[PDB]
Amino acid sequence: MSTLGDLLAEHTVLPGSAVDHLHAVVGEWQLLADLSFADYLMWVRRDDGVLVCVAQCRPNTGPTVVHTDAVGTVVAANSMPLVAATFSGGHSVEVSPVRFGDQVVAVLTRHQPELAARRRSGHLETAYRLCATDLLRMLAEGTFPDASRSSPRAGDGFIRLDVDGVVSYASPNALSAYHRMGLTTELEGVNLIDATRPLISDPFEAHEVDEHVQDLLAGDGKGMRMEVDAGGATVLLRTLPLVVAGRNVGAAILIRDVTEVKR
Amino acid sequence: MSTLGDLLAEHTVLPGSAVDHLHAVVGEWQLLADLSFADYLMWVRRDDGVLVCVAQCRPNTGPTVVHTDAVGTVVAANSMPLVAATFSGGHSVEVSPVRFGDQVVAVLTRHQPELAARRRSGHLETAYRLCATDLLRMLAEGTFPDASRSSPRAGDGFIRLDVDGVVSYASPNALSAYHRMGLTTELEGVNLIDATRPLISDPFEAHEVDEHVQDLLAGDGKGMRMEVDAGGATVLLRTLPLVVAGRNVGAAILIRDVTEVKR
Ligand SMILES: [Br-]
Ligand SMILES: [Br-]
Ligand SMILES: [Br-]
Ligand SMILES: [Br-]
Ligand SMILES: [Br-]
Ligand SMILES: [Br-]
Ligand SMILES: [Br-]
Ligand SMILES: [Br-]
Ligand SMILES: [Br-]
Ligand SMILES: [Br-]
Ligand SMILES: [Br-]
Ligand SMILES: [Br-]
Ligand SMILES: [Br-]
Ligand SMILES: [Br-]
Ligand SMILES: [Br-]
Ligand SMILES: [Br-]
Ligand SMILES: [Br-]
Ligand SMILES: [Br-]
Ligand SMILES: [Br-]
Ligand SMILES: [Br-]
Ligand SMILES: [Br-]
Ligand SMILES: [Br-]
Ligand SMILES: [Br-]
Ligand SMILES: [Br-]
Ligand SMILES: [Br-]
Ligand SMILES: [Br-]
Ligand SMILES: [Br-]
Ligand SMILES: [Br-]
Ligand SMILES: [Br-]
Ligand SMILES: [Br-]
Ligand SMILES: [Br-]
């Protein structure tokens, strides 16, 4: 009886809406573990005030520090004072809440390698860690996840857009994919739509992408997954609007060149 | 004009069969870059004896050392003596051939972090690197690839089976997935089918998996991708038979828990 669903039914009295939301978190948090270069555990609090670990993720972009399976672990609340308190007043372990409605419905613990063993902070690792912090804030504010097997992983290609839709960071993989798509220009410092629109092969899709990204940034649209042909290449795109305290602070875009994977 | 296809047509006189095979390599070699914790570049040799880089992959499981896009690079043969020689007589850069028919149709260069900056060799990293060596040998022998967007990545869950179908190594993620599927036992040292069969929910699928793995190990069957329900969980499995000099030396299995990704 080991799934998140079985565990939440056994140990918890969360309503079906919050149960859905936690299922959605676990369905999405590979991206968080990858961008953080960290392990996460998800903890719920029963009636008893007793704590249960109901899910766990490891990063694919670096070593785990949680080699043992933690799921199903049931622990007295005072053996984890902070986690217990995060349910209340709201490894190198950081603790953060997951909100739904306005209740903390779960708490994540983040575990990662001690300082000299970790992914040295080049630009890629900085841009990823900064995005992980943005999503952790959305988790705490109850705005991510909102409401697939094939979507890009962070390592496939990562782009950070600022509020005006200007690329503030593009990973080497993302730049690789845009070159295969026909980009002969830099990506960083350029309006993403202006760089992207001319590359897209079908003129209807070109406009769809343009409108999507405009809506994303405006708060008019949710993130989407899409497959686009450009320049002989086929890329998969996944967009994620980023928000603080009810406002848009740009977007993350994941991209995967699937030209040869497709075929 | 930046795709592998456009590049091979422009610079090469390879027959359509070998052109297919290189497309297949690029469609699959994310798994090699991930298991190697390394970058790869693919090089072809024109008429001129001049060398062209026609594809490039970075690892998702560690930092790249090739930050620049190398695709389309055209270089005199003697500026890369070894690569040139690998076409002939058959970073920390290792060079290996890709055979098709019995010709070397391309050469891979592997580039990776200098020794103190790399993924320290715990068991996971050793098991991955050993499998990468097995596939590089199959590439050199022309037996991999043979002939999807959703299949497991190496980091999702990795299992090495020996010739008798006994698990010689299972990553933490793989063990995690088998626990969600209902495994209350160790995986390492156990016959994989015997551990797996009782967990599978549908009795027809249980038998299919059993037969597949038997065929895989016998050389009676190619690798496959499959989605299975077990114990309330849903996993995606991808099998890869491993072969040296015409014989089976077991198999790699990649597994991804898609219980919450599915939903
Ligand atoms: Br993901
Ligand atoms: Br690890
Ligand atoms: Br542990
Ligand atoms: Br364990
Ligand atoms: Br704590
Ligand atoms: Br450590
Ligand atoms: Br950034
Ligand atoms: Br899918
Ligand atoms: Br825009
Ligand atoms: Br990258
Ligand atoms: Br750029
Ligand atoms: Br345009
Ligand atoms: Br335009
Ligand atoms: Br969508
Ligand atoms: Br196209
Ligand atoms: Br892969
Ligand atoms: Br990945
Ligand atoms: Br990197
Ligand atoms: Br470089
Ligand atoms: Br570049
Ligand atoms: Br060389
Ligand atoms: Br280095
Ligand atoms: Br092994
Ligand atoms: Br697919
Ligand atoms: Br067997
Ligand atoms: Br793992
Ligand atoms: Br085990
Ligand atoms: Br059975
Ligand atoms: Br059985
Ligand atoms: Br298949
Ligand atoms: Br089931």
Curated annotation (Swiss-Prot), chains A, B:
PTM info: Autophosphorylated.
What GO biological process term is on the record, naming one?
Answer: phosphorelay signal transduction system
Q: Where is this region: GAF?
A: 4-132
Annotated spans, PAS-like: 156-263
Q: Where is this protein localized, as stated in its record?
A: Cytoplasm
Instruction: Note the effect listed for residue 43 to A.
Output: Loss of activity, cannot rescue a deletion mutant
Question: How is it regulated at the activity level?
Answer: Binding to c-di-GMP activates PdtaS autophosphorylation and by extension phosphotransfer to PdtaR. At the opposite, autophosphorylation and signaling cascade are inhibited by NO, copper and zinc. Activity is not inhibited by calcium or iron. Full inhibition of PdtaR/PdtaS signaling cascade requires the transduction of a cell surface signal by the intramembrane protease Rip1.
S-S bonds? none
| Phosphoprotein in keyword set | yes
Q: Give its E.C. classification number.
A: 2.7.13.3
**One GO term describing the cellular component:** cytoplasm
**Gene Ontology MF annotations:** ATP binding; phosphorelay sensor kinase activity; protein kinase activity
Please give the chief subcellular localization of this protein: cytoplasm
Q: Which UniProt keywords are given for this protein, alphabetically ordered? A: ATP-binding, Cytoplasm, Kinase, Nucleotide-binding, Phosphoprotein, Stress response, Transferase, Two-component regulatory system
| Catalyzed reaction equations | ATP + protein L-histidine = ADP + protein N-phospho-L-histidine
Task of the protein = Member of the two-component regulatory system PdtaR/PdtaS. This two-component system plays an essential role in mycobacterial adaptation to poor nutrient conditions. Nutrient deprivation results in increasing intracellular concentrations of cyclic diguanosine monophosphate (c-di-GMP), which binds to the PdtaS sensor and promotes its autophosphorylation, leading to the activation of the signaling cascade. The phosphate group is then transferred to PdtaR. In addition, the PdtaR/PdtaS two-component system controls copper and nitric oxide (NO) resistance downstream of the intramembrane protease Rip1. This coupled Rip1/PdtaS/PdtaR circuit controls NO resistance and acute lung infection in mice by relieving PdtaR/PdtaS-mediated repression of isonitrile chalkophore biosynthesis. Two signals are required to fully inactivate the PdtaR/PdtaS system and mediate NO resistance: a cytoplasmic inhibitory signal through the PdtaS kinase mediated by direct sensing of NO and the production of PPE1-5', an NO-induced small RNA, to sequester PdtaR.
Per the entry's comment, what about the domains? Answer: The N-terminal sensor region consists of closely linked GAF and PAS domains. Binds c-di-GMP via the GAF domain. Copper and NO are detected through a dicysteine motif in the GAF domain.
Q: How does it assemble?
A: The N-terminal sensor region is a monomer in solution, but it forms non-covalently linked dimers over time.
| UniProt miscellaneous comment | Was identified as a high-confidence drug target.
Q: What is this protein called?
A: Sensor histidine kinase PdtaS
Write the gene name.
pdtaS
